[PDB]
Amino acid sequence: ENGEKITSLHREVEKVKLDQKRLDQELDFILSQQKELEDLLSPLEELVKEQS
Amino acid sequence: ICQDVENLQKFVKEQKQVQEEISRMSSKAMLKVQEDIKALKQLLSLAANG
């Protein structure tokens, strides 16, 4: 009777870890959008001190 | 015949020993389990809600 619960415990646990992984690598990547979109707001600091 | 009762009561009693033996052996370990899985299930709900 307990063993069964154990089962849908295992279940739903590794689908939680499918979860987190994912959200994990997600946060890297939203994170990388933040390193790129930054270097290059400037190198947009050319294009704008040139105009100047 | 009274060799005899020396043995039969003896094999019977030998058996009561095992009966005692099982009696000695009894559960709390078991009772413990439902409590824990009931508990682990709950933490899983946490993590999930998190």
Tab-separated table of N, CA, C and O in Angstrom:
chain	number	residue	atom	x	y	z
A	1	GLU	N	0.836	-1.137	0.000
A	1	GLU	CA	0.000	0.000	0.000
A	1	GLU	C	0.889	1.209	0.000
A	1	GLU	O	0.613	2.172	-0.700
A	2	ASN	N	1.989	1.179	0.780
A	2	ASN	CA	2.952	2.259	0.787
A	2	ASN	C	3.835	2.208	-0.440
A	2	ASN	O	4.088	3.237	-1.087
A	3	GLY	N	4.173	0.955	-0.903
A	3	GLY	CA	5.122	0.826	-1.977
A	3	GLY	C	4.700	1.671	-3.207
A	3	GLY	O	5.554	2.270	-3.858
A	4	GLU	N	3.371	1.783	-3.523
A	4	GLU	CA	2.689	2.310	-4.675
A	4	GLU	C	3.053	3.960	-4.654
A	4	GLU	O	3.542	4.610	-5.604
A	5	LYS	N	2.751	4.573	-3.518
A	5	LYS	CA	3.130	5.839	-3.310
A	5	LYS	C	4.497	6.143	-3.514
A	5	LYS	O	4.916	7.192	-3.974
A	6	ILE	N	5.285	5.126	-3.116
A	6	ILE	CA	6.714	5.255	-3.326
A	6	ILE	C	6.910	5.501	-4.825
A	6	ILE	O	7.769	6.302	-5.203
A	7	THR	N	6.127	4.854	-5.715
A	7	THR	CA	6.184	4.728	-7.153
A	7	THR	C	5.795	6.222	-7.697
A	7	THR	O	6.438	6.870	-8.512
A	8	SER	N	4.651	6.703	-7.344
A	8	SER	CA	4.471	7.771	-7.926
A	8	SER	C	5.153	8.988	-7.427
A	8	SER	O	5.471	9.849	-8.205
A	9	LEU	N	5.856	8.685	-6.311
A	9	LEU	CA	6.951	9.494	-5.834
A	9	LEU	C	8.137	9.478	-6.720
A	9	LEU	O	8.661	10.524	-7.041
A	10	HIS	N	8.621	8.304	-7.170
A	10	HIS	CA	9.791	8.218	-7.997
A	10	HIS	C	9.477	8.960	-9.209
A	10	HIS	O	10.294	9.701	-9.762
A	11	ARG	N	8.218	8.793	-9.630
A	11	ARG	CA	7.754	9.485	-10.801
A	11	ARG	C	7.925	10.720	-10.940
A	11	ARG	O	8.613	11.314	-11.777
A	12	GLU	N	7.112	11.208	-10.032
A	12	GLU	CA	6.894	12.537	-10.326
A	12	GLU	C	8.257	13.262	-9.958
A	12	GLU	O	8.506	14.405	-10.361
A	13	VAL	N	9.201	12.651	-9.086
A	13	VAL	CA	10.496	13.218	-8.685
A	13	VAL	C	11.512	13.418	-9.882
A	13	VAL	O	12.050	14.535	-10.030
A	14	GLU	N	11.852	12.326	-10.647
A	14	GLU	CA	12.743	12.537	-11.691
A	14	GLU	C	12.042	13.470	-12.738
A	14	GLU	O	12.710	14.290	-13.389
A	15	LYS	N	10.647	13.547	-12.857
A	15	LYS	CA	9.903	14.679	-13.907
A	15	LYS	C	10.193	15.900	-13.184
A	15	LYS	O	10.477	16.794	-13.966
A	16	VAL	N	10.325	16.197	-11.783
A	16	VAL	CA	10.751	17.413	-11.143
A	16	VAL	C	12.233	17.643	-11.587
A	16	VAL	O	12.710	18.762	-11.580
A	17	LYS	N	13.030	16.579	-11.965
A	17	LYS	CA	14.398	16.855	-12.151
A	17	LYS	C	14.670	17.050	-13.618
A	17	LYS	O	15.698	17.615	-13.998
A	18	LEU	N	13.708	16.568	-14.348
A	18	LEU	CA	13.720	16.822	-15.756
A	18	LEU	C	13.561	18.436	-15.487
A	18	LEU	O	14.134	19.188	-16.289
A	19	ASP	N	12.759	18.860	-14.433
A	19	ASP	CA	12.353	20.312	-14.310
A	19	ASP	C	13.339	21.167	-14.103
A	19	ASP	O	13.449	22.198	-14.797
A	20	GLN	N	14.046	20.745	-13.126
A	20	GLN	CA	14.896	21.734	-12.776
A	20	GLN	C	15.932	21.829	-13.754
A	20	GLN	O	16.473	22.918	-13.885
A	21	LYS	N	16.274	20.722	-14.436
A	21	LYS	CA	17.322	20.914	-15.343
A	21	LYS	C	17.176	21.745	-16.288
A	21	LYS	O	18.082	22.308	-16.922
A	22	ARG	N	15.974	21.543	-16.624
A	22	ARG	CA	15.830	22.432	-17.531
A	22	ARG	C	15.860	23.795	-17.374
A	22	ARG	O	16.486	24.577	-18.110
A	23	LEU	N	15.126	24.257	-16.326
A	23	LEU	CA	15.008	25.656	-15.941
A	23	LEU	C	16.413	26.172	-15.728
A	23	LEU	O	16.757	27.346	-15.941
A	24	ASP	N	17.323	25.246	-15.318
A	24	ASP	CA	18.731	25.485	-15.130
A	24	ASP	C	19.639	25.802	-16.191
A	24	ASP	O	20.307	26.848	-16.117
A	25	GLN	N	19.671	24.912	-17.129
A	25	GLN	CA	20.468	25.324	-18.244
A	25	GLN	C	19.712	26.745	-18.726
A	25	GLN	O	20.455	27.536	-19.311
A	26	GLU	N	18.266	27.093	-18.662
A	26	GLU	CA	17.294	28.250	-19.205
A	26	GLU	C	17.845	29.520	-18.712
A	26	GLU	O	17.910	30.536	-19.394
A	27	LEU	N	18.267	29.434	-17.484
A	27	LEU	CA	18.742	30.525	-16.789
A	27	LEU	C	20.126	30.844	-17.256
A	27	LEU	O	20.671	31.875	-16.885
A	28	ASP	N	20.807	29.918	-17.938
A	28	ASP	CA	22.095	30.235	-18.495
A	28	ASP	C	21.943	30.964	-19.598
A	28	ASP	O	22.681	31.855	-19.994
A	29	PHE	N	20.919	30.433	-20.192
A	29	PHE	CA	20.985	30.968	-21.553
A	29	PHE	C	20.394	32.344	-21.455
A	29	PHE	O	20.932	33.244	-22.105
A	30	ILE	N	19.274	32.679	-20.677
A	30	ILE	CA	18.627	34.027	-20.537
A	30	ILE	C	19.772	34.828	-20.048
A	30	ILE	O	19.881	35.996	-20.414
A	31	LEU	N	20.673	34.225	-19.248
A	31	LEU	CA	21.804	34.878	-18.692
A	31	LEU	C	22.747	35.311	-19.817
A	31	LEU	O	23.306	36.424	-19.756
A	32	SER	N	22.993	34.452	-20.858
A	32	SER	CA	23.931	34.767	-21.948
A	32	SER	C	23.369	35.840	-22.843
A	32	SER	O	24.105	36.629	-23.446
A	33	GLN	N	22.027	35.933	-22.906
A	33	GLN	CA	21.440	36.924	-23.727
A	33	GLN	C	21.852	38.247	-23.118
A	33	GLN	O	21.966	39.235	-23.838
A	34	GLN	N	21.989	38.291	-21.787
A	34	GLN	CA	22.454	39.417	-21.017
A	34	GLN	C	23.947	39.691	-21.139
A	34	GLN	O	24.291	40.787	-20.772
A	35	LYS	N	24.880	38.746	-21.522
A	35	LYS	CA	26.295	39.129	-21.611
A	35	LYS	C	26.484	39.780	-23.002
A	35	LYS	O	27.188	40.785	-23.197
A	36	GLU	N	25.889	39.146	-24.059
A	36	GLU	CA	25.875	39.607	-25.560
A	36	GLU	C	25.230	40.762	-25.656
A	36	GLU	O	25.665	41.652	-26.388
A	37	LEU	N	24.058	40.869	-25.060
A	37	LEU	CA	23.201	42.098	-25.514
A	37	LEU	C	23.835	43.149	-24.875
A	37	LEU	O	23.417	44.284	-25.149
A	38	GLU	N	24.671	42.931	-23.839
A	38	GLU	CA	25.458	44.009	-23.262
A	38	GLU	C	26.805	44.485	-23.937
A	38	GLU	O	27.002	45.691	-23.898
A	39	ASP	N	27.731	43.634	-24.519
A	39	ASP	CA	29.078	43.825	-24.868
A	39	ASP	C	28.531	44.893	-25.904
A	39	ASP	O	29.001	46.039	-26.016
A	40	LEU	N	27.676	44.203	-26.614
A	40	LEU	CA	27.303	45.017	-27.837
A	40	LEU	C	26.184	46.030	-27.473
A	40	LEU	O	25.364	46.345	-28.400
A	41	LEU	N	25.826	46.549	-26.335
A	41	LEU	CA	25.091	47.688	-26.587
A	41	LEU	C	26.214	48.445	-26.980
A	41	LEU	O	25.984	49.537	-27.402
A	42	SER	N	27.473	48.113	-26.557
A	42	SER	CA	28.481	48.619	-27.165
A	42	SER	C	29.434	48.126	-27.737
A	42	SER	O	30.426	48.672	-27.367
A	43	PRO	N	29.238	47.294	-28.476
A	43	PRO	CA	30.303	48.148	-28.897
A	43	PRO	C	29.645	49.558	-29.951
A	43	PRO	O	30.428	50.404	-30.587
A	44	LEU	N	28.220	49.750	-29.583
A	44	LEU	CA	27.162	50.719	-30.081
A	44	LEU	C	27.494	52.236	-29.468
A	44	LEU	O	26.735	53.020	-30.141
A	45	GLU	N	28.381	52.219	-28.241
A	45	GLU	CA	29.404	53.269	-27.504
A	45	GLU	C	30.794	53.645	-29.243
A	45	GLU	O	30.686	54.672	-29.374
A	46	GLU	N	30.811	53.193	-30.871
A	46	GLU	CA	31.361	53.509	-32.284
A	46	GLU	C	30.734	54.381	-33.096
A	46	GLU	O	31.396	55.386	-33.361
A	47	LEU	N	29.731	53.820	-33.219
A	47	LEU	CA	28.783	54.097	-33.921
A	47	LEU	C	28.116	55.263	-33.387
A	47	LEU	O	27.948	56.287	-34.044
A	48	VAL	N	27.730	55.398	-32.116
A	48	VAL	CA	27.299	56.645	-31.315
A	48	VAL	C	28.637	57.638	-30.916
A	48	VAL	O	28.389	58.834	-30.902
A	49	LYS	N	29.930	57.354	-30.534
A	49	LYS	CA	31.092	58.440	-30.436
A	49	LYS	C	31.664	58.686	-31.724
A	49	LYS	O	32.651	59.402	-31.894
A	50	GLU	N	30.857	58.265	-32.748
A	50	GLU	CA	31.446	58.674	-33.931
A	50	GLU	C	30.598	59.656	-34.297
A	50	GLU	O	31.079	60.481	-34.976
A	51	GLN	N	29.360	59.486	-34.139
A	51	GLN	CA	28.449	60.478	-34.551
A	51	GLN	C	28.740	61.800	-33.871
A	51	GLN	O	28.477	62.863	-34.418
A	52	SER	N	29.063	61.632	-32.613
A	52	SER	CA	29.416	62.702	-31.823
A	52	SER	C	30.538	63.457	-32.568
A	52	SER	O	30.449	64.628	-32.927
B	1	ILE	N	6.133	-45.850	26.345
B	1	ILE	CA	5.111	-44.835	26.381
B	1	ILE	C	5.629	-43.701	27.182
B	1	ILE	O	5.368	-42.529	26.903
B	2	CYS	N	6.341	-43.970	28.273
B	2	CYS	CA	6.720	-42.673	28.862
B	2	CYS	C	8.012	-42.244	28.614
B	2	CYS	O	8.353	-41.246	29.189
B	3	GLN	N	8.633	-42.797	27.534
B	3	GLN	CA	9.865	-42.365	26.752
B	3	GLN	C	9.154	-41.348	26.053
B	3	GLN	O	9.531	-40.167	25.830
B	4	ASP	N	8.057	-41.947	25.814
B	4	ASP	CA	7.400	-41.302	24.849
B	4	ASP	C	6.918	-39.918	25.105
B	4	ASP	O	7.174	-39.047	24.323
B	5	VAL	N	6.228	-39.654	26.230
B	5	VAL	CA	5.720	-38.329	26.433
B	5	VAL	C	6.965	-37.406	26.604
B	5	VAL	O	6.812	-36.187	26.358
B	6	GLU	N	8.186	-37.989	27.028
B	6	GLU	CA	9.410	-37.213	27.288
B	6	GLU	C	9.548	-36.429	25.930
B	6	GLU	O	9.639	-35.209	25.961
B	7	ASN	N	9.558	-37.080	24.685
B	7	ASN	CA	9.736	-36.502	23.337
B	7	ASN	C	8.614	-35.641	22.836
B	7	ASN	O	8.870	-34.538	22.376
B	8	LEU	N	7.363	-36.107	22.849
B	8	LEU	CA	6.319	-35.372	22.151
B	8	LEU	C	6.174	-34.029	22.774
B	8	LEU	O	6.175	-33.032	22.060
B	9	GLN	N	6.093	-33.953	24.121
B	9	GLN	CA	5.931	-32.670	24.740
B	9	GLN	C	7.163	-31.905	24.366
B	9	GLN	O	7.158	-30.683	24.249
B	10	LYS	N	8.301	-32.598	24.256
B	10	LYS	CA	9.502	-31.901	23.940
B	10	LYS	C	9.451	-31.223	22.503
B	10	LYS	O	9.764	-30.041	22.371
B	11	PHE	N	9.092	-31.943	21.391
B	11	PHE	CA	8.976	-31.478	19.977
B	11	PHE	C	7.846	-30.321	20.081
B	11	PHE	O	8.014	-29.219	19.536
B	12	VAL	N	6.732	-30.511	20.848
B	12	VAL	CA	5.682	-29.529	20.884
B	12	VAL	C	6.186	-28.270	21.467
B	12	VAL	O	5.973	-27.182	20.951
B	13	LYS	N	6.865	-28.388	22.603
B	13	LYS	CA	7.387	-27.253	23.266
B	13	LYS	C	8.420	-26.647	22.476
B	13	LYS	O	8.633	-25.442	22.558
B	14	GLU	N	9.124	-27.491	21.730
B	14	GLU	CA	10.386	-26.943	20.924
B	14	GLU	C	9.658	-26.021	20.100
B	14	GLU	O	10.225	-24.960	19.859
B	15	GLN	N	8.451	-26.350	19.572
B	15	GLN	CA	7.745	-25.509	18.640
B	15	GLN	C	7.257	-24.249	19.307
B	15	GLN	O	7.211	-23.197	18.684
B	16	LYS	N	6.833	-24.322	20.572
B	16	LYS	CA	6.364	-23.116	21.205
B	16	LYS	C	7.507	-22.148	21.267
B	16	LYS	O	7.296	-20.931	21.360
B	17	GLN	N	8.752	-22.665	21.354
B	17	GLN	CA	9.843	-21.753	21.359
B	17	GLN	C	9.810	-20.940	20.119
B	17	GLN	O	10.050	-19.738	20.165
B	18	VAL	N	9.567	-21.548	18.947
B	18	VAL	CA	9.630	-20.754	17.758
B	18	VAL	C	8.519	-19.742	17.850
B	18	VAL	O	8.605	-18.622	17.340
B	19	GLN	N	7.373	-20.141	18.442
B	19	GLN	CA	6.223	-19.240	18.504
B	19	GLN	C	6.590	-18.025	19.285
B	19	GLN	O	6.228	-16.881	18.989
B	20	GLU	N	7.402	-18.304	20.316
B	20	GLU	CA	7.926	-17.203	21.211
B	20	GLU	C	8.823	-16.440	20.297
B	20	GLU	O	8.769	-15.223	20.416
B	21	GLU	N	9.614	-17.131	19.501
B	21	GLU	CA	10.596	-16.456	18.756
B	21	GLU	C	9.960	-15.463	17.894
B	21	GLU	O	10.441	-14.343	17.768
B	22	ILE	N	8.853	-15.819	17.254
B	22	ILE	CA	8.198	-14.848	16.381
B	22	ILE	C	7.725	-13.772	17.226
B	22	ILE	O	7.907	-12.627	16.850
B	23	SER	N	7.194	-14.007	18.413
B	23	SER	CA	6.622	-13.086	19.374
B	23	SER	C	7.643	-12.128	19.788
B	23	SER	O	7.426	-10.931	19.800
B	24	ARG	N	8.830	-12.579	19.903
B	24	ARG	CA	9.887	-11.622	20.310
B	24	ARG	C	10.055	-10.641	19.345
B	24	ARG	O	10.470	-9.537	19.443
B	25	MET	N	9.920	-11.027	17.988
B	25	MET	CA	10.389	-10.338	16.689
B	25	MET	C	9.584	-9.054	16.277
B	25	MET	O	10.217	-8.282	15.594
B	26	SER	N	8.304	-8.865	16.639
B	26	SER	CA	7.231	-7.750	16.322
B	26	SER	C	7.697	-6.120	15.660
B	26	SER	O	8.898	-5.803	15.568
B	27	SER	N	6.707	-5.203	15.106
B	27	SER	CA	6.839	-3.824	14.301
B	27	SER	C	6.509	-2.480	14.856
B	27	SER	O	5.368	-2.208	15.214
B	28	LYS	N	7.513	-1.623	14.560
B	28	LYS	CA	7.489	-0.197	14.757
B	28	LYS	C	8.144	0.318	13.485
B	28	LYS	O	7.941	1.424	13.002
B	29	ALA	N	9.084	-0.439	12.952
B	29	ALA	CA	9.810	-0.206	11.757
B	29	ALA	C	8.760	-0.054	10.728
B	29	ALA	O	8.797	0.942	9.999
B	30	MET	N	7.766	-0.991	10.745
B	30	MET	CA	6.778	-0.870	9.745
B	30	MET	C	5.948	0.372	9.862
B	30	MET	O	5.605	1.055	8.898
B	31	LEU	N	5.550	0.716	11.103
B	31	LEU	CA	4.663	1.811	11.378
B	31	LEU	C	5.370	3.035	10.902
B	31	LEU	O	4.773	4.014	10.451
B	32	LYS	N	6.702	3.035	11.016
B	32	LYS	CA	7.478	4.176	10.680
B	32	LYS	C	7.265	4.555	9.231
B	32	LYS	O	7.161	5.749	8.936
B	33	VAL	N	7.172	3.540	8.350
B	33	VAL	CA	7.236	3.796	6.941
B	33	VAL	C	6.150	4.702	6.430
B	33	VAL	O	6.443	5.696	5.766
B	34	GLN	N	4.870	4.448	6.757
B	34	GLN	CA	3.796	5.207	6.167
B	34	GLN	C	3.960	6.627	6.535
B	34	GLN	O	3.591	7.530	5.786
B	35	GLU	N	4.501	6.854	7.730
B	35	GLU	CA	4.644	8.212	8.142
B	35	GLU	C	5.595	8.923	7.217
B	35	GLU	O	5.348	10.052	6.795
B	36	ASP	N	6.727	8.264	6.868
B	36	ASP	CA	7.767	8.863	6.057
B	36	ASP	C	7.321	9.091	4.645
B	36	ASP	O	7.487	10.195	4.126
B	37	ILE	N	6.722	8.071	3.988
B	37	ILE	CA	6.354	8.296	2.607
B	37	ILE	C	5.298	9.365	2.582
B	37	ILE	O	5.245	10.140	1.625
B	38	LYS	N	4.416	9.414	3.613
B	38	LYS	CA	3.395	10.440	3.669
B	38	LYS	C	4.109	11.756	3.727
B	38	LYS	O	3.655	12.725	3.124
B	39	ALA	N	5.233	11.838	4.494
B	39	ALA	CA	6.049	13.047	4.642
B	39	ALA	C	6.812	13.415	3.364
B	39	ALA	O	6.780	14.563	2.938
B	40	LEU	N	7.506	12.464	2.687
B	40	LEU	CA	8.300	12.705	1.494
B	40	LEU	C	7.416	13.171	0.388
B	40	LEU	O	7.847	13.969	-0.448
B	41	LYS	N	6.179	12.637	0.340
B	41	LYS	CA	5.313	13.013	-0.724
B	41	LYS	C	5.149	14.492	-0.568
B	41	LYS	O	5.103	15.228	-1.545
B	42	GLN	N	5.043	14.994	0.686
B	42	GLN	CA	4.723	16.383	0.923
B	42	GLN	C	5.847	17.283	0.490
B	42	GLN	O	5.654	18.372	-0.053
B	43	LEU	N	7.103	16.878	0.751
B	43	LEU	CA	8.233	17.724	0.367
B	43	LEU	C	8.261	17.817	-1.166
B	43	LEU	O	8.751	18.778	-1.812
B	44	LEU	N	7.858	16.737	-1.823
B	44	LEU	CA	7.860	16.727	-3.258
B	44	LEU	C	6.894	17.741	-3.757
B	44	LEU	O	7.125	18.356	-4.776
B	45	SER	N	5.751	17.900	-3.076
B	45	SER	CA	4.761	18.908	-3.436
B	45	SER	C	5.341	20.286	-3.283
B	45	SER	O	5.016	21.205	-4.035
B	46	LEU	N	6.213	20.444	-2.281
B	46	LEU	CA	6.899	21.678	-2.092
B	46	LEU	C	7.668	22.060	-3.288
B	46	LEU	O	7.533	23.183	-3.778
B	47	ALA	N	8.496	21.076	-3.715
B	47	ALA	CA	9.531	21.346	-4.670
B	47	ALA	C	8.821	21.628	-5.876
B	47	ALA	O	9.209	22.447	-6.691
B	48	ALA	N	7.744	20.890	-6.113
B	48	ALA	CA	6.953	21.081	-7.293
B	48	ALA	C	6.333	22.470	-7.357
B	48	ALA	O	6.396	23.139	-8.391
B	49	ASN	N	5.683	22.918	-6.246
B	49	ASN	CA	5.062	24.229	-6.105
B	49	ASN	C	6.150	25.281	-6.219
B	49	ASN	O	5.912	26.415	-6.625
B	50	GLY	N	7.394	24.964	-5.795
B	50	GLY	CA	8.503	25.871	-5.975
B	50	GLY	C	8.991	26.013	-7.342
B	50	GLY	O	9.195	27.116	-7.813
